[PDB]
């Protein structure tokens, strides 16, 4: 029992007495009721996710935000495009999830206003071309914390209050598949830099169905990684995570219901 710092996130003041589950959502009706299921399954947030023409990315994301606004659960956007961020916030999205660390030109300007939650992810890459890079680290843990601290500073320098910001070590983006990813999972609480109050920024962790998983289970396909994905989530929560982003929602909630019983009893002594 440690408590991750709260996250102001749009409509919702989110507090982490228990860690929360982000269901990954990504036909428009197909996905309307796919989200009613996720909520019923125990999802506490919904992650609305070549690449795509702005014309298109907008057609497929903006209706979904308005379609699901009234369900009243935190709605999160997986985008690095400022135009996408600008639009989605206006349509009432609660949290922006950006692989690029709010580095694309304009990104910080598009989100410095309002109450939305912001999660800055670590990734090794050249923002200009959007080419993901090859690993290169001193201590990968020091390096990821260092990077994310610079990004929390950048956001705060443009008016963003410390408490709207959570961070993400970016399993799978520029990391040696096992050596770097598991180093970060093993050291998870040490990957978040300090808020001005001294508390660490809450951490979001997304490992679901990822390569780091398939590499330790003799190479199973992305859809054959459920129990592996659950396991990574528990390890992450056992080590500090505030939120875990997953495709397999009910399994993850079941697991975390066991973990919370355990912690509830370690506290009763």
Residue numbers in the entry: 3 to 28, 42 to 64, 73 to 292
Direct quotes from the study:
Dihydropteroate synthase (DHPS, EC: 2.5.1.15) catalyses the reaction of 6-hydroxymethyl-7,8-dihydropterin-pyrophosphate with p-aminobenzoic acid (p-ABA) to yield 7,8-dihydropteroate and pyrophosphate. In so doing the enzyme supports the biosynthesis of folate, a key metabolite required to support the synthesis of DNA, and proteins. BcDHPS displays a triosephosphate isomerase (TIM)-barrel fold, consisting of eight parallel β-strands surrounded by eight α-helices. The DHPS active site is formed entirely within a single subunit.
The purified protein was used in co-crystallization screens with the inhibitor sulphadoxine or the enzyme product 7,8-dihydropteroate. However, analysis of the crystals grown in the presence of sulphadoxine revealed only water molecules in the active site and this therefore represents the apo-BcDHPS structure determined to 2.35 Å resolution. The apo-enzyme crystallized in space group C2221 with one molecule in the asymmetric unit. A number of residues could not be modeled in the electron density maps and so were omitted hence the model for this structure consists of 268 residues. The first C-terminal loop, linking β1 to α1 could not be modeled in either structure, due to poorly defined density, suggesting a significant degree of conformational flexibility. The crystallographic analysis of the apo-enzyme clearly showed the normal side chains not interacting with each other.
